Amino acid sequence: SPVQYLRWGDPAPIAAVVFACLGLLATLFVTVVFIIYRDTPVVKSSSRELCYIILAGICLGYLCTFCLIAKPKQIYCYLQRIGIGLSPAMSYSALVTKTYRAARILAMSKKNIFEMLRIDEGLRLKIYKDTEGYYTIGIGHLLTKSPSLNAAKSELDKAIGRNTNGVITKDEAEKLFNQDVDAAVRGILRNAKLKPVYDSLDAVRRAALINMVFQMGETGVAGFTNSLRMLQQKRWDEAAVNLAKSRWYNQTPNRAKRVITTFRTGTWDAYKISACAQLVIAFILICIQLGIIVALFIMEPPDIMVYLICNTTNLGVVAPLGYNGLLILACTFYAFKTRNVPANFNEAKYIAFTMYTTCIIWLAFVPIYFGSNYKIITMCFSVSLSATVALGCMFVPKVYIILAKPER
Numbered sequence: 001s002p003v004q005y006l007r008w009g010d011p012a013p014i015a016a017v018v019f020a021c022l023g024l025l026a027t028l029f030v031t032v033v034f035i036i037y038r039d040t041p042v043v044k045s046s047s048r049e050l051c052y053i054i055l056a057g058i059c060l061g062y063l064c065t066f067c068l069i070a071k072p073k074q075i076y077c078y079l080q081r082i083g084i085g086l087s088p089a090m091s092y093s094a095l096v097t098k099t100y101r102a103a104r105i106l107a108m109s110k111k112n113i114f115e116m117l118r119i120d121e122g123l124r125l126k127i128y129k130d131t132e133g134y135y136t137i138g139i140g141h142l143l144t145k146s147p148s149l150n151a152a153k154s155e156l157d158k159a160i161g162r163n164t165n166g167v168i169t170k171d172e173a174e175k176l177f178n179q180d181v182d183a184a185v186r187g188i189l190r191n192a193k194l195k196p197v198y199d200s201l202d203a204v205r206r207a208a209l210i211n212m213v214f215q216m217g218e219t220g221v222a223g224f225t226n227s228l229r230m231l232q233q234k235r236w237d238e239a240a241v242n243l244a245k246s247r248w249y250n251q252t253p254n255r256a257k258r259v260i261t262t263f264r265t266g267t268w269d270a271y272k273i274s275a276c277a278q279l280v281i282a283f284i285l286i287c288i289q290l291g292i293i294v295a296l297f298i299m300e301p302p303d304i305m306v307y308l309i310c311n312t313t314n315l316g317v318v319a320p321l322g323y324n325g326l327l328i329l330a331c332t333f334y335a336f337k338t339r340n341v342p343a344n345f346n347e348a349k350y351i352a353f354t355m356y357t358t359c360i361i362w363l364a365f366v367p368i369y370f371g372s373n374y375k376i377i378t379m380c381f382s383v384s385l386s387a388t389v390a391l392g393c394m395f396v397p398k399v400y401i402i403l404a405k406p407e408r
C-alpha cells in the first residue's frame, strides 16, 4: 500500500499515484468535452480521430505508474514494457501524421504563389544579372554580390545540394523562391502600414499582396493607403475599382489586372495555376513499435526481479526509446516548419511548443534515468510529465476556448 510507505517515510509512491490520478481525471475531463462539443469549429476543423488516439496514449501514459507501482504479478511486467513503449508511440505517431499533413498543405500553398510569380514576373533556369549587375538566378533570387562568376556558382551549389554548373530546374528554382517569400513576409510584418492588412487577408489574397511587394517594394505598396484600408475592411469591389485608377495599373496593365482580380474573388481564377489514409499510417507506425516490443518479449522474457522490480535490461528500454525518439524528432521537424501557420486559432503554435519541451524532457531523461538509483520513481515522473505537457499545451488551450469563448 502506497500509504504505508508514506508513513514509513517514503512519499514517492503515493505522490506518483496522485499525479497519475489527477492526470487521468484531467484527460477524462478533456475527452468528454470533445465528445459533447464535437460539432464546434474549434474541434471540427482538426482531425478528430487522431485526437482520440493522442488522448488514449496520454491516458495509458498515466496508467503506467499503476504498473510501476503494483502488487508483484507477472503480467504487470508485461504491461510496463507495453505501456512505457506503446503509449508515446500512440500519441506521437498520430501527431506526426497531423504535422506532416500541415507541412504538405503549407508546401502546396508556397507552390501556388511560386506559379503566380513565374507567370507574372518570369523565371531563368541559368545565372543572369539584375539591373544592378549582381548575379541572379530563378525568380530574381540573388546569389552573391561578388563580381566573380565562380562565386555565384559556389553559392548556388550550397543552396541546391549538387553541382549545378549554373543551371537549375523549375523545382530547384522554387526552392530558392521559398526563401525569398519568407524574407518578404518578414519585411511586411516589420512594416506598420502593411502588417494590419496582411493579418486580415486569407491565404490567396496574401499572395496577391506579396506579389505587389515583389514588384514595387514595401515602400511602394504602402502608398496604396486607401486601397489597403478597403482590403482590410474586406471591401473587395471598392478596392478593385480603386486599384484600377493607379499609375501602377496603367504602367503594367496585363499583370495588375490579374493581381486585382485575385483581390476581388480571393481565388486563382486569373491564373491557370485523406482522413482514412492518416489513420492507416498512424496505425502502421504504432504496429512497428509493438513489433519491437513483442520481439524483445521473445529475446528477453520479462520476469519479476509497493515497488515492482522487473528484469527489463537496457536494450529492453533503449530500443523502444530510440524509436519513440524518431517519432518525436519527425514531429518537431514538421511542427517547426508549420509554426507560423494560423489555422485553428494558431493551433500550430501550441504543437511546436509542446515538441520543444518534449525533446528537452526526453533528451534530459537519458542521462538522468540510466544514472539513477531510483529508476521506477524516475520513470513514473518522466512519463507523467511527458503526458502532462502534451495534455496541457495542446488540449487545455482548446478546451478553454470552447468553454470561455463561445462567441469566438
Ligand SMILES: N#Cc1cc(Cl)cc(-c2cc(-c3ccc(F)cn3)ncn2)c1
Pocket: 054, 057, 058, 059, 060, 061, 062, 064, 083, 084, 085, 087, 088, 091, 092, 317, 321, 361, 362, 365, 382, 383, 386, 387, 388, 390, 391
Ligand atoms: N523509456 C522511457 C520514457 C521516457 C519518457 Cl521521458 C517518457 C515516456 C513515456 C511517455 C508517454 C506519453 C504518452 C502520451 C504523451 F502525449 C506523451 N508521453 N507514455 C509513456 N511513457 C517513456
Ligand SMILES: CCCCCCCC/C=C\CCCCCCCC(=O)O
Pocket: 314, 318, 321, 322, 324, 325, 326, 328, 329, 358, 359, 360, 362, 363, 366, 370
Ligand atoms: C529529441 C527526440 C527524443 C530524444 C531522443 C531519445 C533518446 C534515445 C536515443 C538514444 C539514447 C542512447 C542510448 C541509451 C544509452 C544507454 C545508457 C546505458 O545503458 O548505460
